[PDB]
């Protein structure tokens, strides 16, 4: 199990690759499930931040068939610019191995489906100034998205297990990044 | 498609069974899977009781093991006599066909996942008047926990489609009795 594993449009999933263990995650209205590790680190660093009333986990696990109706509907309902912009190819999201997370706020009208609200919020401000420090990392920053391929989603937070999410927090790297300067260093 | 399967303690799914057609479902504030028809008779529901800001789609469609790990959640968390009173046993419930949805109220923080509030609003006193007209029964009735084997659930319903909601609402039928009902009136 790589918590480094690279998963995107360039890099999709394994149809061999194992189905993740899971286990269903706490702080949510509804049921989430997440690799074990992941969830374990999600409820310290809500536990640790004293969050437990201001967010609350929106998404977790998604099968491929999942992530394939999500892909559909958005499609459908939203048209495809929208959801090149914002939703992973079936076989391309993080999703589907069960170590992303999408994070919103507790007090919410207008909640949405793919973009879930965490932004402008003092909550949202406290977590970001902890999650690297429980394995996370704000998976598609802003004026990232020529790396990524994906445009910034401030809900969405990938677990990469420490130092690495304090690495590349502290560059302000994507994971992208990440596997470039690992790789270029061995090749040094 | 059996809309009218009888999935319980008594009667588990098979491996028997394809797995469901899916589609993402409206009217929730995260991804929620549903069968097709159950979606789109859930969405017609919620826009003719005019219950868009009102009501939200909780739960739909559950993995084996996604269900087995909500099960563990629960022993883990609220106890053995508890989990078996609210939570169906892996392979046994409705949600891993995609014909069950647990729905709750739109405005209610810190919900609970294993039991969402659904009583006590004129949201769910409307619903309960209108579900049966769009194909959905109260699963587990009150008066009826000896025959499901599980304890009062007015948050959770099945879509069985027309007319069978209507004839199992206006009779106080559990989905249990109305398999017995139709099999006695074949027999004459
Ligand atoms: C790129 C992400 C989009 P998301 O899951 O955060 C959004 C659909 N809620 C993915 O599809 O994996
Ligand atoms: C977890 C909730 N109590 P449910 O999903 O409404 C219970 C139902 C019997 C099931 O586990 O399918
Ligand atoms: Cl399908
Ligand atoms: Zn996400
Ligand atoms: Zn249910």
Redesign the interface.
């Known amino acids: 199990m790589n918590t480094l594993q690279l998963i995107n449009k360039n890099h999709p999933l394994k149809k061999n690759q194992e189905?993740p263990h899971?286990?269903?995650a706490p702080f949510?209205?509804?049921?989430?499930?997440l690799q074990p590790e992941v969830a374990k680190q999600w409820e310290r660093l809500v536990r640790a931040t004293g969050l437990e009333?201001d967010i609350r986990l929106?998404?977790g696990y998604?099968?491929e068939?999942?992530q394939r109706?999500?892909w559909?509907?958005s499609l459908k309902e939203n048209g495809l610019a929208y959801t090149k912009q914002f939703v992973a190819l079936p076989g391309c999201s993080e999703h589907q191995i069960g170590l992303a997370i999408?994070v919103?706020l507790?007090?919410?009208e207008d909640?949405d489906?793919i973009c879930?609200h965490f932004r402008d919020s003092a909550a949202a401000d406290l977590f970001m100034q902890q999650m690297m420090n429980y394995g996370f990392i704000l998976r598609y920053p802003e004026d990232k998205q020529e790396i990524t391929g994906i445009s910034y989603e401030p809900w969405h937070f990938r677990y990469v297990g420490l130092p690495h999410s304090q690495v590349i927090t502290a560059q302000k790297w994507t994971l992208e990044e990440y596997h470039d300067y690992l790789a270029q260093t061995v090749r040094q």
């Not at 949510?28 to 499930?33: F, I």
């Open positions: 189905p899971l286990v269903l949510s209205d509804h049921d989430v499930y009333k929106v998404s998604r099968t068939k999942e109706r999500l559909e509907y999408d919103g507790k007090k919410q909640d489906l879930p």
